[PDB]
């Protein structure tokens, strides 16, 4: 075939990071379906090829595993699926409708990549060992591989949600996202799960700090689904710790949350009283290898934050509790894609 | 001379990290003055030589500067000053008393190294530029150079304080150090300085969390002078921010401090409401190059924490305030020297 040729060609191009403004303008109306088709038929191959080339540069002990080869198979098939539209006519609406349907198939084809790549980490641990150097090499690749996946799925979802059929939300982006509302939604979901497994759930306490406009609700341009995922994973760990640490007690400390809006950053602290974690083991929380056993929520949650020039940091105090801050860019002009 | 020969010989030996227990046993009584003399006459050259060899492996643009050469001069002179005692007799008390006096001279000879090395950073900035790669290379060396200085001064102070003339404190180590008392002492000093420059000072609030012994005062084996230095620098920055941020307000938020004692870590959080720092600029607080202008308190404060397997981490929220946690090892068995 020509798959090694396509990868070599499109790997010479560099991924083009986009800004929240560019995302909003790409989906301003339905007349830009042809501009997105002309852009995605060239951008998606570049991003798919750049990561495919790094996969092929992995050590043979990792590359020959059935997991890496099954994922590499999907990427090749999705690349070729997009090759077909490079010569078609944007003016023909049938070319556009078939492109949208093709992206949905590519999206469902890669919907089980995180579990598949997790099976490979477990295989490597039991096949070669859990060496400190093996952790960094696997951390380096998975952080870049998962961040690339998030970028490709963002492009696909922005096209299949805006350019389907015929606005408050511009696809997956909400230009007036109330952070507190997403915090409550994530807490309510974790509460339902915690109330059924432990028969007890900590309460919630939200506090907003709008520095330049005191008492003005905090809004931002962001992907609420990504913020929900990060907050949902943090709440689950905070509740399990708050409950399991007070099983022999009657007081159940609440999970407090602070939303602060500055001139450049929008932070979301989350505090609990779960007995903290020793500093020596804090690295294991964001480690794919040390989080594998016969979940990648926190490692991937930090990638969702870094996807738009953010970060997710943890700082605990053994004997008391743990804190978690989601650092986001408050301004849309600074919210640009971070691509590997 | 033979200085390049001594460096080559003693650079083949590796620095021997010591534990709090070993420090306590070395100064248990005055009968160990000869055991410390036999140990320090061999250990100090090794530590002095290992850092001197890294200084000589620096780039010529940094090595030829007058600052690096003035410090390199002091190190060579101190090495030679210790060479003289390698052949003397430990049984002769005059050999011991002259060794103590020699260490005091070496201590006062290197008492102005941090300012001298800071002048070199400023010279480099104005001579070659403040490049991101230049920051990491200077950060890598100064962190290791200053940490080596702290280790050498710890050995010297433990000998000149225990073996002088003829116990609650074992030299600079307090086997029953109340963390809260050191926090109050550091706050009181920063309050006096803040009350004179700003005519206003935030208040203090301490809370202890002894997990295994609730309401039992928290004590540890540590060097109170090192803990005072770290807390004193953090209080100064927290007060300036709390005051300068509320100059147009009447409420002056307090600086809260949490002391937590776990099974492995002893943490000291310090919170303020000074308007926080953007995440993009948090790295500048611990950067020697970005903290230089025509202080190294925070960078060196983090080294004092890492000296015994600790750490000092900062996490801010722009628009609200900043938090600082001093991570220390609660158990003496885990408090071992971290040497470059
Ligand atoms: C006590 C505890 N507080 C925690 N609070 C957390 C927060 C809140 C928002 C600030 C966010 C993210 C993680 C934790 C977390 C973990 C643990 C914890 N406890 N053990 C562990 C180990 C890993 C592990 O097995 N983690 C499972 C999922 C877990 C078990 C019990 C409670 C919570 C998580 C570690 C020592 C390597 O981490
Ligand atoms: C607002 C502010 N809160 C702060 N709170 C701090 C804490 C407390 C215990 C948790 C510890 C250590 C440092 C800060 C700190 C710095 C600044 C700050 N503000 N600007 C800066 C710049 C550097 C600088 O010039 N720092 C001077 C010494 C300073 C000026 C005014 C207040 C405090 C320090 C930075 C953007 C690169 O850092
Ligand atoms: Cl994927
Ligand atoms: Cl020195």
From Swiss-Prot, chains A, B:
Binding of ATP, residues: 233-240, 272, 291-292, 295-298
Induction: Down-regulated by insulin. Up-regulated by reactive oxygen species and cigarette smoke extract. Up-regulated by PPARD.
A Pfam entry, by short name: HATPase_c
Swiss-Prot/TrEMBL keywords: ATP-binding, Kinase, Mitochondrion, Nucleotide-binding, Phosphoprotein, Transferase, Transit peptide
Gene Ontology terms for molecular function: ATP binding; protein homodimerization activity; protein kinase activity; pyruvate dehydrogenase (acetyl-transferring) kinase activity
Keyword Transit peptide appears in the UniProt entry: yes
Record-linked Gene3D superfamilies: Alpha-ketoacid/pyruvate dehydrogenase kinase, N-terminal domain, Histidine kinase-like ATPase, C-terminal domain
Catalytic activity: L-seryl-[pyruvate dehydrogenase E1 alpha subunit] + ATP = O-phospho-L-seryl-[pyruvate dehydrogenase E1 alpha subunit] + ADP + H(+)
SMART domains recorded: HATPase_c (SM00387)
Domain Histidine kinase: 122-332
Cellular localization per UniProt: Mitochondrion matrix
One Gene Ontology term, aspect cellular component: nucleoplasm
The protein's enzyme class: transferase
Activity: how regulated: Activity is enhanced by binding to the pyruvate dehydrogenase subunit DLAT. Inhibited by ADP and pyruvate; these compounds interfere with DLAT binding and thereby inhibit kinase activity. Inhibited by dichloroacetate. Inhibited by AZD7545; this compound interferes with DLAT binding and thereby inhibits kinase activity.
Positions carrying Phosphotyrosine: 197-198
Tissue-level expression: Expressed in many tissues, with the highest level in heart and skeletal muscle, intermediate levels in brain, kidney, pancreas and liver, and low levels in placenta and lung.
EC number: 2.7.11.2
GO biological process: cellular response to nutrient; cellular response to reactive oxygen species; glucose homeostasis; glucose metabolic process; insulin receptor signaling pathway; intrinsic apoptotic signaling pathway by p53 class mediator; regulation of acetyl-CoA biosynthetic process from pyruvate; regulation of calcium-mediated signaling
Superkingdom of origin: Eukaryota
Assembly information from the UniProt record: Homodimer, and heterodimer with PDK1. Interacts with the pyruvate dehydrogenase complex subunit DLAT, and is part of the multimeric pyruvate dehydrogenase complex that contains multiple copies of pyruvate dehydrogenase (E1), dihydrolipoamide acetyltransferase (DLAT, E2) and lipoamide dehydrogenase (DLD, E3).
PANTHER family: [PYRUVATE DEHYDROGENASE (ACETYL-TRANSFERRING)] KINASE ISOZYME 2, MITOCHONDRIAL, PYRUVATE DEHYDROGENASE KINASE
Function recorded in the entry: Kinase that plays a key role in the regulation of glucose and fatty acid metabolism and homeostasis via phosphorylation of the pyruvate dehydrogenase subunits PDHA1 and PDHA2. This inhibits pyruvate dehydrogenase activity, and thereby regulates metabolite flux through the tricarboxylic acid cycle, down-regulates aerobic respiration and inhibits the formation of acetyl-coenzyme A from pyruvate. Inhibition of pyruvate dehydrogenase decreases glucose utilization and increases fat metabolism. Mediates cellular responses to insulin.
Family note: Belongs to the PDK/BCKDK protein kinase family.
Name this polypeptide is given: [Pyruvate dehydrogenase (acetyl-transferring)] kinase isozyme 2, mitochondrial
Organism name: Homo sapiens
Biological classification of the source: Eukaryota, Metazoa, Chordata, Craniata, Vertebrata
Recorded name of the encoding gene: PDK2
């Amino acid at each position: 075939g020509s798959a090694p040729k396509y990868i070599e060609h499109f790997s010479k191009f560099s991924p083009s990071p986009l800004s929240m403004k560019q995302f909003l303008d790409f989906g301003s109306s339905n007349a830009c379906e042809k501009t997105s088709f002309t852009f995605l038929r060239q951008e998606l191959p570049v991003r798919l090829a750049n990561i495919m080339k790094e996969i092929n540069l992995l050590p043979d002990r990792v590359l020959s595993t059935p997991s890496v080869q099954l994922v590499q198979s999907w990427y090749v098939q999705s690349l070729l699926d997009i090759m077909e539209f490079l010569d078609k006519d944007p003016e023909d609406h049938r070319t556009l409708s078939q492109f949208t349907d093709a992206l949905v198939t590519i999206r469902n084809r890669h919907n089980d990549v995180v579990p598949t790549m997790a099976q490979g980490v477990l295989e490597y641990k039991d096949t070669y060992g859990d060496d400190p150097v093996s952790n960094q090499n696997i951390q380096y690749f998975l952080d870049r591989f998962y961040l690339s996946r998030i970028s490709i799925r963002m492009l696909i979802n922005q096209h299949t949600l805006i350019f389907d059929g015929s606005p408050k939300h511009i696809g997956s982006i909400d230009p007036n996202c109330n952070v507190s509302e997403v915090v409550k939604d994530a807490y309510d979901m974790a509460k339902l799960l915690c109330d059924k497994y432990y028969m007890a759930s900590p309460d919630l306490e939200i506090q907003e700090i709008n520095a330049a406009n005191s008492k003005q609700p905090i809004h931002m341009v962001y992907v609420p689904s990504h913020l929900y995922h990060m907050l949902f994973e943090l709440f689950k760990n905070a509740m399990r710790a708050t409950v399991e640490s007070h099983e022999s007690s009657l007081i159940l400390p609440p999970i407090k949350v602070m939303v602060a809006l500055g001139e450049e950053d929008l932070s979301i602290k989350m505090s609990d009283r779960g007995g903290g974690v020793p500093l020596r083991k804090i690295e294991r929380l964001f480690s794919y290898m040390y989080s594998t056993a016969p979940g990648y929520g926190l490692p991937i949650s930090r990638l969702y934050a870094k996807y738009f020039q953010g970060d997710l940091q943890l700082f605990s105090m053994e004997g008391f509790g743990t804190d978690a801050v989601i650092y986001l860019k408050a301004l849309s002009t600074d919210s640009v894609e971070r691509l590997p």
